[PDB]
RNA sequence: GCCCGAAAGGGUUGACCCUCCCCGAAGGAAACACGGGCGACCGUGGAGUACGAGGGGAGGUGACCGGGGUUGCACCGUCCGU
RNA sequence: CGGAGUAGGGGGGCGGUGUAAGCCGUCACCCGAGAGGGGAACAACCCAGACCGGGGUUAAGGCCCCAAAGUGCCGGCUAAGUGUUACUCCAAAGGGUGUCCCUGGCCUUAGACAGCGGCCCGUCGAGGUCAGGGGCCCCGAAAAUGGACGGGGCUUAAGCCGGCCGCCGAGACCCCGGCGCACGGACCGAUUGGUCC
């Protein structure tokens, strides 16, 4: 089935293009993914949203 | 054109991504060049860059390697190193790039892209220096 | 004389037979047992070679003199049975070239002597009682310094069993 | 590693207010207020009800050393805003008495070894110097600046050209933060 | 239930054998085995063939001799 | 318009095949299912409007690229250009 | 890409291009559904399907193709005899 | 029975000699007399032996950009740009409370520093102290035109250790179609043969 490499790559490109509309909130991230992306699957969209949430967590914090 | 803010980005990774963009065919602008970082020890980094700047042809200095002293030119030169520079294809791809220190009034009023693969946060060892500090050590204007 | 890295290794055939070697030299070493010889000591401290080796009689004699002077100044002849176990039987040769004829008819004339030793082989031994293990180890170190390759020391009891760790822990 | 969750704790005294603003420590007390930036990857400084707590959740030796160092620095800040620090210097000479005087942000020393030129030491802001004959006092609110001022007053008198078994003139520290210097 | 295991064995480096005893937290012993392999390989540069395990026996949290595991288990 | 970018010729670092080409589709859905284009025709336009026609053969890698055959092959003036899928 | 192209070469008894249909070597997917694995991934079904070098056939528009000279891009290539 | 060419060999492994480089032999894999795919380029190191046009799968090796394919996964180490070197073509004896591990003894509820008080107690009252061995790194470590991990550059790596999962990549291997050669055969020529199987 659909692999996580595709998800991480697409989420990484979305975040790169728009690092101003994505936040630490899972549901707002879902909504903004649905808005700014032309995907046609809740599975793919929600996975992208989760990975974007992790991205924001990391880019805010840092070791 | 794709405008990228360099604040808090690792130089070589930024340059790799930008070079691949250029070869695929996009126009790229980079702002805030002085705020990208280089990891490692201050003295080793400074020594390397000084050695670079002191390279010259012994029979004619009007010829010879011209390694930069400015931050924007340093970034540009890293990118150029990451391209095929002895071909028309790479010459065009490199012509398609522009780098700026700060954010000039022209670009003032826009939202800037970033790069995830390149960001100061993937690091864990605090040893790091700034390109602006390198430029100051070398004696260049900004 | 010539550096010892020339004679260190053991890659050449054995050359130990004097009824055929013309002009071979005598040894510069005559004493191999020092101290007290009939005193039945407790601890036996023995050196061991880390890899195969070829030791010059010069090095052997220097080791002897230094270690014996140390043990005399510190322990006393009444103690410390000191023994060297290996004898120099190899003959070393040098090509007589340096008017000259270079590499014409190169077969060396004899110059000196050396002892051959294999891996994990005993070279010398100090027999001593408990109250002088410090000086026995000092002698081990001094001898270690004057050797072409590296060596390790071990300790043995009566019945010849290894008690090195137990004796090293408790000083 | 060494342990799991290394954690050090400091008890806050009478009227000392301790605050964190992300990597800085603000310390207010009866006298003065101090700030200091302390950061290391993985070390967290946060305030409980009445405690300063320094934490790292899987540490090595160097992290342990970092933590203990930060604890010592915070304790110094607290003690400083509570009481203060006081260093002491002693003046000695064999021939050519020299005069030490305070001029604004500088201490000036004249007639050292008979030189026609004066030596100068820089006083840092927040420190006060008092000269009463052969004894000098550096009083202040922060230990680093106080010790640095004292060290500058000392290093303004150092010789390199003649044997010091015979040429011994100068100014010397005798008491660090209430701790005599002994050989 | 998360179990505490104790591992005993020997490893050989440069022709010299050396015994070892360790303690781990895990659900099974296969995880423990993989972790032991990886850790000894890293810290002493030993391949898996030169590592021999004799015993992976389950113990209780309070009869242990490792501070990290002891604090993680209380 | 259901288009893709021409990236490179096929081969290794030292040699190349000039009748085969690597294509990157731009739509995220086609990139997620690039194998559902195997067998499709794909066209490139020349500066004079002429048409060169090729065919998508199989997948290339795991990121979402595809391989295409173009006999008669493409010129080097088409390596960072757009191509239209049918 | 620009230029030449009468004859000796093909071609209105149809050049080139377009659309659909049948067979098909070696080889050979994917979406999706159910499970194993910390994980990168994998297994089962879809499926020997879609596709596939070539081999054949049906309908449309109607005039060049092959060849030659020079040049542009990509990659390769350190002369001949002894 | 007839016609020759060869009487300077070299790389790689083994042996005698030699300070060594080299000299002399030996084996008979390679170059010579051997295309193609890799090692940055390399006569002989790795894959692999070549009629022509095509379609596929692998090998050596590789997957941050140059450059086709992973900014791949799990556990750990290094802070010195150490390193980023299978070989061709890489500095040691001796040292290091630098860090990560293993083992074996000795003290412990008042121990091992400092301290109130001249082997003693009231307090700082919780674990500490000696020996061996291993991994990585550091010191030891100086050269001449300006400069070499192939370059850019890289620090929970784009390095190292122990393992794993996918992909890219030859004229090698599989497949379709064409040319020739060797051997055998059938039929057929007004001379050294021809058509086909």
Curated annotation (Swiss-Prot), chain B:
GO cellular component terms, semicolon-separated: cytosolic large ribosomal subunit; ribosome
Record has Ribonucleoprotein as a keyword: yes
Gene Ontology MF term list: mRNA binding; structural constituent of ribosome
GO BP annotation list: negative regulation of translation; translation
Annotated CDD domains: Ribosomal_L13 (cd00392)
InterPro entries linked to this entry: Ribosomal_uL13, Ribosomal_uL13_bac-type, Ribosomal_uL13_CS, Ribosomal_uL13_euk/arc, Ribosomal_uL13_sf
Keywords tagged on the record: Ribonucleoprotein, Ribosomal protein
Similarity comment: family membership: Belongs to the universal ribosomal protein uL13 family.
Record-linked HAMAP family: Ribosomal_uL13 (MF_01366)
Subunit: Part of the 50S ribosomal subunit.
The protein's role, per its UniProt record: This protein is one of the early assembly proteins of the 50S ribosomal subunit, although it is not seen to bind rRNA by itself. It is important during the early stages of 50S assembly.
UniProt protein name: Large ribosomal subunit protein uL13
Organism: Thermococcus kodakarensis (strain ATCC BAA-918 / JCM 12380 / KOD1) (Pyrococcus kodakaraensis (strain KOD1))
Gene giving rise to this polypeptide: rpl13
UniProtKB/Swiss-Prot annotation, chain C:
Keywords: Ribonucleoprotein, Ribosomal protein
Keyword Ion transport in record: no
A GO CC term attached to the entry: cytosolic large ribosomal subunit
One Pfam assignment: Ribosomal_L16
Transmembrane annotation, as ranges: none
Any one of the GO BP annotations: translation
GO MF terms, alphabetically ordered: structural constituent of ribosome
Keyword Nucleotide-binding: no
Gene3D superfamilies to which the protein is assigned, alphabetical: Ribosomal protein L10e/L16
Family recorded in the similarity comment: Belongs to the universal ribosomal protein uL16 family.
Description of how the protein assembles with itself and partners: Part of the 50S ribosomal subunit.
Protein name: Large ribosomal subunit protein uL16
Organism: Thermococcus kodakarensis (strain ATCC BAA-918 / JCM 12380 / KOD1)
Gene: rpl10e
Curated annotation (Swiss-Prot), chain D:
PROSITE patterns in the record: RIBOSOMAL_L6_2
SUPFAM superfamilies: Ribosomal protein L6 (SSF56053)
Swiss-Prot/TrEMBL GO biological process terms: cytoplasmic translation
Pfam families attached to this UniProt entry: Ribosomal_L6
Alphabetized GO MF terms: rRNA binding; structural constituent of ribosome
Keywords: Ribonucleoprotein, Ribosomal protein, RNA-binding, rRNA-binding
Function noted in UniProt: This protein binds to the 23S rRNA, and is important in its secondary structure. It is located near the subunit interface in the base of the L7/L12 stalk, and near the tRNA binding site of the peptidyltransferase center.
Name used for this protein in its record: Large ribosomal subunit protein uL6
Organism: Thermococcus kodakarensis (strain ATCC BAA-918 / JCM 12380 / KOD1) (Pyrococcus kodakaraensis (strain KOD1))
UniProtKB/Swiss-Prot annotation, chain E:
Sorted UniProt keywords: Ribonucleoprotein, Ribosomal protein, RNA-binding, rRNA-binding
Example GO BP: translation
Any single Gene Ontology cellular-component annotation: ribonucleoprotein complex
Gene3D superfamilies: 3.10.20.10
InterPro entries: Ribosomal_eL20, Ribosomal_eL20_dom
A GO molecular-function descriptor: structural constituent of ribosome
A Pfam family: Ribosomal_L18A
Similarity field: Belongs to the eukaryotic ribosomal protein eL20 family.
Cited HAMAP family: Ribosomal_eL20
NCBIfam families, sorted: PRK00773.1-1
Quaternary context: Part of the 50S ribosomal subunit. Binds 23S rRNA.
Annotated protein name in UniProt: Large ribosomal subunit protein eL20
Organism of origin: Thermococcus kodakarensis (strain ATCC BAA-918 / JCM 12380 / KOD1) (Pyrococcus kodakaraensis (strain KOD1))
